[PDB]
């Protein structure tokens, strides 16, 4: 039994560690394919090799043995595990078992409890194969689905769904108990593109592939019709979800809900500064007075309503449109009172108008260096107090 | 009428609801998910990895 394909290499760059883990995983998966599939079938928690998932195959790689390494090596071993899954998928398909006619594909944003849903499915006598994996980029799944339909098997795809924020909370717990969480990049990519992938499957294969959904934000409600599955899964664009996730994991870290390790694996390879800079404030203003600052948003019909009040002493009366702030040019120094701050931005009143600084600058955290109401200078990262009494 | 896989999925949803209101049940599902390789499997893997070092 050989691998059903060559394993694709990712580019790890100057990281020699991950680059060598990658080649070790590929060598293991390519040369010991037979003994690996046999251990997976006879000895792992896989229903005799019928539950096929790349994340279960990861546990048979030496680099994944120790809990504290799993977040770091995951990307480096993934493709090897996924091709091992396809090989396994094909070996289950080749077994002559006319009784078993049903193939179930289960997918969802990480932390949506898709794996837990699979574990709570009980194998029936007609169940041939259970595959769990991403269908946001469905090309790989096309090859699997084709083979099912060549053999007259009935295919069902189950889309498990949850808001990114709550799924993110579940990924933290998994990182802490098991050692693997999930990057905000893959979470956003998946939740944004999953509908498109399911669309591409419906348009290639038709009614032949039954597509259903499980909404975990409505107490695991089963959703039967395709059009309704697409509705439930419309939870924002990739930029919107990524932007929201970046703000969450930064606030969660800044307030002490997550360790630095948990924050770094959630960060993944994202430049947070570049996400935070894309955030828009066009319908938002800040009203300052002697009691504090109030963040307000405008509705379509020009009405302002309150979002957040922060108590602060010593500020004068003011109204600042946040969407008209000037971006801070790099290398220049800006002086004056911080009037508002959040996870993504710091707004500063200078002599040349309101200025916006990214809340992170080259992986250093600007927002924690300054308080709302404080007179400061910001340049480059050099922050100085300008506070005095005369 | 409804296929078998679709019943299995509905039954799975009911068990997901049970997890929300039964701490002991959730904890045995989550213990199984994150268990990792059994000592029996891990013994077999060790032989496998060690025999095929470069």
Residue numbers in the entry:
A (entry chain B): 2 to 381, 386 to 395
B (entry chain A): 7 to 60
Paper text:
A prototype of a Gram-negative epsilon/zeta TA module, the epsilon_1/zeta_1 (ngε_1/ngζ_1) TA system, is encoded by Neisseria gonorrhoeae, an obligate human pathogen causing the sexually transmitted disease gonorrhoea. Thereby, we identified a yet undescribed enzymatic activity. The toxic activity is inhibited by co-expression of ngε_1 antitoxin, corroborating that the ngε_1 / ngζ_1 locus encodes for a toxin/antitoxin pair. As expected for a bona-fide type II TA system, we demonstrated protein-protein complex formation between ngε_1 and ngζ_1, which assemble into a heterodimeric complex.
To this end, we first determined the crystal structure of the catalytically inactive ngε_1/ngζ_1(K115A) selenomethionine substituted protein complex at 2.4 Å resolution using single anomalous dispersion experiments. We found four heterodimeric ngε_1/ngζ_1(K115A) TA complex molecules located in the asymmetric unit, a complex arrangement which we also observed in solution. In fact, not only the quaternary structure is set apart from known zeta toxins, but also the tertiary structure and mode of inhibition is very different to other zeta toxins. Strikingly ngε_1 binds as an extended polypeptide stretch onto the molecular surface of ngζ_1 and does not fold into a globular domain. In addition, also the tertiary structure of ngζ_1 is different to known zeta toxins, as it consists of two domains. Although our initial analysis of the primary sequence did not identify these homologues, a structural alignment revealed that two sequence blocks were shuffled by swapping position within the polypeptide chain. Yet, two loop regions were topologically rewired in ngζ_1 when compared with other zeta toxins leading to a similar tertiary structure albeit these two blocks occur at different position within the amino acid sequence. Nevertheless, residues that have previously been shown to be important for enzyme catalysis are found to be structurally conserved in ngζ_1. Finally, the C-terminal domain has the fold of an oligonucleotide/oligosaccharide binding domain (OB-domain) and consists of a five-stranded Greek-key β-barrel that is in an open distorted conformation capped by a short α-helix.
